[PDB]
Amino acid sequence: IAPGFLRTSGNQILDSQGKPVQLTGVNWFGAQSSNGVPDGLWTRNYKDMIDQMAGQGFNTIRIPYASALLHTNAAPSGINYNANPDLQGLTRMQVLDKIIDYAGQAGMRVILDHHRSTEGAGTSENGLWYDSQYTEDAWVSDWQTLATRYKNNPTVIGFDLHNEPYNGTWGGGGANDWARAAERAGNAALAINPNLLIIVEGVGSYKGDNYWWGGQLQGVKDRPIQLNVANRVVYSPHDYPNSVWQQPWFQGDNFGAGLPAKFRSEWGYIYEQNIAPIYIGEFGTKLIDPKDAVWLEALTSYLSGDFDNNGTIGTEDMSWTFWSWNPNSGDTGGILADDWRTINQNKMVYLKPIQYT
């Protein structure tokens, strides 16, 4: 991708020369945990991992973090400093700086994702972007601190304002209105860096329709995100297979035939109607449950622009980051095997045709 920040135009993400580009990467989680740094540095070197990502055709790293990362003085834990000698004596944020810096040198971009408030493993137990101790005020101010820190670094292209706010609502104006909260944090971040992409995930349910956490983007049609800087909003659904949860739209034979219409109903319509870009922030599978393959086959085809999954498709297709680069995800696994080095080729076969080239 051409150097400099990005922008949106219709359902397209454009580089600094007006050319449509595509973000096709992986999730590298860990910085939201108690260690305060992305996982795997207890056995791998951080430059070797980024090079391996780029060598597999990926160009984007979604990096989850926790609010607690921005206020802790604890040193990072777990890093093997024999294998990562350049990270010796660095703070948790300084290790993030090192990772972002090298990723830009390797031709990759970075999306920061507020995964949770406290240090933990996955999605916030609250289903919200705040709790009784980590306020929405501090969440907004923390996004301003991050925007300031990477204001002059176009490697950091976008802010994923919050991971899966499945207990928020799309509208209503109250304290749990995720659309209001996202517009508040988006404008606060854009006031410091107006060149950031503002990545807004969906909720969990909307007018009685329940979908994957983060993948319920049905509210955009009647109440879209409106920020004080134009051409910055990217919508980010999450989608997963039967092995993660036995959803009703996976049940019964011929379920795969109705998956394209299901993708379009919850979030895909935003791209098809040229409303805004679509960047699915999470999706993964171990490819053991046979229904998982039917889902991934339909999903990858839909993301490519084959909205009816028949075979027919100067714009780019939908952007995406796979869950995960890490192997240590219990339900989905990742791109790397448990040894944190071996590539799972059976997943790469699905991903390579929809990577940005």
Contacts of 67 (CB under 8 A, 6+ apart): 114, 116, 117, 118, 134, 138, 139, 142
Least distance from Br ion to the Cβ atom of residue 121, Å: 6
Q: Residues 110-149: x/- map of binding to Br ion (CB under 5 A)?
A: ---------x------------------------------
> Of residues 136, 164, 183, 316, which has the active-site annotation?
164
Report 61-90 residues binding Br ion (CB under 5 A): 84, 86
Coil, helix or strand for 75?
coil
Q: Which two tokens stand for residue 272?
A: 């098809």
Binding segment (CB under 5 A) for Br ion, from list 3-11, 28-36, 123-131, 259-267:
28-36
> What angle, rounded to 10 degrees, do the helices at 178-192 and 136-149 form?
30
Number of residues that bind Br ion (CB under 5 A): 5
151/341 with CB nearer Br ion: 341
- How far apart are the C-alpha atoms of 160 and 151, rounded to whole Å? 16
136 assigned to active site:
no
Q: At what angle do helices 46-55 and 92-105 cross, to 10 degrees?
A: 30
33 is a contact residue toward Br ion (CB under 5 A)? yes
- Rank residues 34 and 91 by Cβ distance to Br ion and give the closer one: 34
Q: Which among 26-34, 90-98, 184-192, 240-248 is the span making contact with Br ion, rule CB under 5 A?
A: 26-34
Using the minimum distance from each CB to Br ion, give the nearer residue, 170 or 340. 340
CB nearer to Br ion: give 119 or 282. 119
Q: Which stretch binds Br ion (CB under 5 A): 30-38, 128-136, 143-151, 152-160?
A: 30-38
Nearest to 181 by CA among 222, 217, 227, 150: 227
Contacts with 82 (C-beta within 8 Å, 6 or more apart), sequence order:
none
Q: How far is the CB of 81 from Br ion (least distance, A)?
A: 9
CB nearer Br ion, residue 29 or residue 283: 29
Query: Would strands 209-210 and 205-206 be described as parallel, antiparallel, or unpaired?
Result: antiparallel
How many C-beta neighbours within 10 Å does residue 176 have?
A: 18
Q: Which residues are catalytic?
A: 164, 282
Which residues of the shown chain bind Br ion in the complex (CB under 5 A)? 33-34, 84, 86, 119
